[PDB]
Amino acid sequence: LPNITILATGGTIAKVGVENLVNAVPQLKDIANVKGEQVVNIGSQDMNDNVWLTLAKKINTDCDKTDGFVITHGVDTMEETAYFLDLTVKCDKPVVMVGAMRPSTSMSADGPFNLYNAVVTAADKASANRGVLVVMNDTVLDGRDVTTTNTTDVATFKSVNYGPLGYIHNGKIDYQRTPARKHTSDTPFDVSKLNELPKVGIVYNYANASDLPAKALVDAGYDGIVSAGVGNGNLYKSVFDTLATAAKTGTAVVRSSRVPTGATTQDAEVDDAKYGFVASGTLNPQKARVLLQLALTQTKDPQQIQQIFNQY
Amino acid sequence: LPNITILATGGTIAGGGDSATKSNYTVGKVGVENLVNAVPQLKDIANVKGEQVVNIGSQDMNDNVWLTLAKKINTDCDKTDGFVITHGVDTMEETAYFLDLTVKCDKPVVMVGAMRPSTSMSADGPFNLYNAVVTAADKASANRGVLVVMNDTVLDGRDVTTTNTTDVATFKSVNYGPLGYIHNGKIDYQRTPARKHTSDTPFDVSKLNELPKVGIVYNYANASDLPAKALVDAGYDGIVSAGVGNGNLYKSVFDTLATAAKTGTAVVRSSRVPTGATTQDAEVDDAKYGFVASGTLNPQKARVLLQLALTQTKDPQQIQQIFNQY
Amino acid sequence: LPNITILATGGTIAGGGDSATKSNYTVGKVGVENLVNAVPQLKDIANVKGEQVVNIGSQDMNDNVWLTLAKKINTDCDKTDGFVITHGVDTMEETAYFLDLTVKCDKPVVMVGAMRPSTSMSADGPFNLYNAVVTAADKASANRGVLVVMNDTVLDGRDVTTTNTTDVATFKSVNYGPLGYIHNGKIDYQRTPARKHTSDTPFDVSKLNELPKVGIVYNYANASDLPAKALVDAGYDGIVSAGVGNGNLYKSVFDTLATAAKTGTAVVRSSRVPTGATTQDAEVDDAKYGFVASGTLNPQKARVLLQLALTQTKDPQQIQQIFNQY
Amino acid sequence: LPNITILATGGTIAKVGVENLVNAVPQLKDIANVKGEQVVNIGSQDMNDNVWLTLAKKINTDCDKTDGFVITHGVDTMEETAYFLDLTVKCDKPVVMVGAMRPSTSMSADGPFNLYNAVVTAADKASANRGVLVVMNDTVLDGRDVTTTNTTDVATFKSVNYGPLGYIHNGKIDYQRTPARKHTSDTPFDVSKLNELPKVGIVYNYANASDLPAKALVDAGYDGIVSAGVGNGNLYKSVFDTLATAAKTGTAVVRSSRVPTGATTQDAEVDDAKYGFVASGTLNPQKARVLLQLALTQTKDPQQIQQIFNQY
Ligand SMILES: NC(=O)C[C@H](N)C(=O)O
Ligand SMILES: NC(=O)C[C@H](N)C(=O)O
Ligand SMILES: NC(=O)C[C@H](N)C(=O)O
Ligand SMILES: NC(=O)C[C@H](N)C(=O)O
Description:
4 copies of one chain form a homotetramer. The longest helix of chain A is centred in the first third of the chain and has 14 residues, at 49-62. The first copy, chain A, has 2 domains: 1-198, 3-Layer(aba) Sandwich (Rossmann fold), CATH 3.40.50; 199-312, Rossmann fold. In chain A, helix 8 packs across helix 9. Chain A has helices at 18-23, 49-62, 78-88, 111-123, 212-219, 237-247, 272-275, 285-295, 302-309, and strands spanning 3-10, 33-42, 68-72, 95-98, 133-136, 139-142, 146-148, 157-159, 166-169, 172-175, 200-204, 224-229, 252-257, 277-279. Chain A is elongated, with a radius of gyration of 20 Å. Chain A is of the alpha/beta class and 312 residues long. The first copy, chain A, contains 9 helices and 14 strands. Chains in contact: A-B, A-C, A-D, B-C, B-D, C-D. Chains A, D: GO terms for molecular function: asparaginase activity; identical protein binding. Chains A, D: Substrate binds at residues 44-45, 75-76.
């Protein structure tokens, strides 16, 4: 039976401790020897750079001591942690994240079977070399494309652009897809000796949008700003003016979109080369922030950041 | 044949690039007469009159174009059988909900745009405009509130949103679904929005020169409170939170909006999550902080209702009631 | 607290396997009392009374269980405040539309099932049944026709379908969207089906012992006409075509149904395609062949309406009118 | 510039001849030298075994004479032809199928840009070794998972279980996925010397379903029957009884589902081993018929057919 390490971080799936979660699912003994460690116990709405750095280093350090990792986490920023670990984890043994939309005490609580299926996924050797995974609602989702689509639905987690890697049925996964984008040990991002990440903020676009958010970030000397643009990454004129300034003043600017699916493209309405802006592609704002932080540990050059956004 | 007025505001439906193949284009560069003349079959279904209100990308849409549109429809109601509004896709869902809450004309108001420019191969704008006129000319379209017609579908202004950056099929009513489908110039309506719209709302913009100041802040891991603080320091009437999950806030953002709400800033919890209600009775004690829960209203759509709510009241209980009825 | 009757028919909500982990299970093996007793919180929202009508997998649902359900609801209407019907997922969308067209009780009728057996880890059935009772007990649920409540969502019997073989979230109203969403025991209704249902339909099954014979044939490349010929040779009252695309037929299948329609078999074009109307004024001259276009009705749902239509009339024009109103 | 062969078969994208279709899109000269051949001019509702056999042999024979193939086809059975060619084509040069929901003469006709994007896809060398493709609505879809989801929508074609391979924007594709299931030259199906396929029929399940369709197929001595089951591939009792008989009497039986997404699984309500039935997995009825016909050119053994349904 596989040795599987659960790293617990909190979320609705749990204040409840790592060992209690395991004990609630005695069928885990059927498929793995599971050891639990508490990393934090926080709502993922309070997830932060320090936790991300902790997790990346803990998995990188303990890779050779276990066969697989399950990370119990909140739903709210699961998609941000998953893509951060996707880009920084050098362990090519399965790393699976799981949470729950309903608490332990709720009718038809989703947590137990979710944890079960996450351990099935971490225990499957076919799961190796697919990068960091999210397993929710009997589905195996790659850390780059996966996102929460509904505020309360148990089926919230979907890979809305490129689809899932595999479905789980009766403790077995039929894997039919693997992410082409470079992940884990195929990325140059090395966080082993970092204690902080570049400061990257996100501003929202809408009708009559204020430039004051964008100006507060520039005024604070932020390393990068992601735009949650309208439609194909477009910018209200005030926000465009403040970000045009930012980009030629030592702030990297990424155009993403508030629109829940599809790429922010080059060659549409915005001359990215003229402004020194970067097109996020299918990365939504919060994912674009992840990659922009990491790109900025290697470069400040807008053209080299665009190459990163085309590769990872 | 019914009298239909097109009020043009620009958008990619009125855009052009130098190639029919290349994705490059500039917006709001073609007049309404040009859009009308690219749909020769329009004569078969309506007496079309075009007026050019503005010629902008909807990325530059603003309060003043909203007040101008609402006042014009309300003023001209008795002069026409229906309105079509040519507009950009990017903020269509915002304009549509604004007009849905402020127009008192109960004759069909239909918005329409296009994802491909007028210059491109298989341009979507011509059939979209044909289908928007069909809808505007349909007696059954009346008393449904303000509509968006895109990709053979009639959507209500409240739930309608753009779901994809490039796809001609992008416009969907992601929570409650479309009102009807258009085939061969006919509509089978099976739904009407229950939320109050148009002549059933108390919002009157006929005398208004401006709208209350409402901003949107994004939540994410390690979110800066600096955007929230910038809006509070400029004395904003309202802030909408694009929350994570069921409208949750990073602790820094939480503390700044809690403080803001105690000095009388209106604060609405919405969600960055593309579908589902931001509910009461979740992780946030709204009554305790004087916050308002957006329901199915996404952050940009919650702004619209919060701006109009702040023209009646600054009370968080009464703003909650408004978010439960409109 | 309102009086709610559960009429149990079996389904996976009443299923069990020897493992909480393994996918193996057998259906309709648990009584209603057992389902009631696994939802202790039901006492908080209703006075629940269970009656076991049948105990079957919905894969074995049939005309006689449909007549038994409709007659029982109609008979007992005055004895209760609402009905919940525990049923399998597989044919729920068929039963739901049958009852939507035949029940004259305008008190909430709510159907509910589960994708995981009662024995499985994170079983969906207990919260599903809680949420089906909430809906049945909600005064606002009345006059909406027959409902399906699954995964925190209230769906109308006409548009509701199962979209996934295993997913707890499978039930969706794929053309016109849900009626409301349930959070913390409360419902925000924003839609009601416009098609006529319940006390607005002319269909009366109170005296009926049987339903007219209606079969379904599948279209595909190189489709055999043998299924179609088998139904015609047994003198079927109606055939529904699961067409390709916009309800198109392979030429062999076409020729057999054309022939059948000229001897008085009712023939409805539906589509194997999971969303969208099978329209008139496409590739098939329906008036020429005496065919009927199903609209948004999928083949199994078109059967339901064709069976009930054939109890009033065998005329293709009047069956077309029925498919345009119900 | 790539040499690209268009094989025309009909559909709404066209009675209009192969050369007229090309001439309507003069921008094709920008991206390929395109030669057109008329194979048939039929509505794809009348697609048939003979056409499938023609196409497979024509592409296999002409592989070395061109850089890429585009097949113009009706929407209605596009998903059946695509999966047939996916399994029988030995050319690992791009094979792209395209159609249109609207005719040439319609307002905002989709055909022109659809054909353009199909040639972009056939001309891209990154398209090679992904198996037979469908390009519709700016999307590249694998021939196995792709299906029509709406009767009239231009965006009808989707890979509803595993998602698309790539999006097309400005004549370029960002490919992020490839089908894992074995296709083209990785399959043993060889149709080069076949003039007919095994007779496989499809029967529909619903409440009070007649056994008469299933009995007519058995009575005709059909080689196989696919069940479009209810839910997870289940069978109305009458249909189950007639198919239990078929399976032990020289008819292969495949359990598929009328439900538009998800696998028909083993280990649910049906003892497949006891009945000698095969579970289709994510193959819908009409796709299951494709693979069942081809499996039956190699074997009649239910256990060997199940292995085929687990591999292709
Ligand atoms: N269901 C959840 O996990 C929500 C919670 N606020 C979290 O993300 O931690
Ligand atoms: N397709 C479009 O219309 C996009 C454009 N930027 C607009 O919103 O005006
Ligand atoms: N989940 C389910 O209920 C499936 C079952 N075969 C039924 O329809 O009775
Ligand atoms: N749009 C289409 O192609 C439909 C047509 N009946 C076909 O498949 O040939």
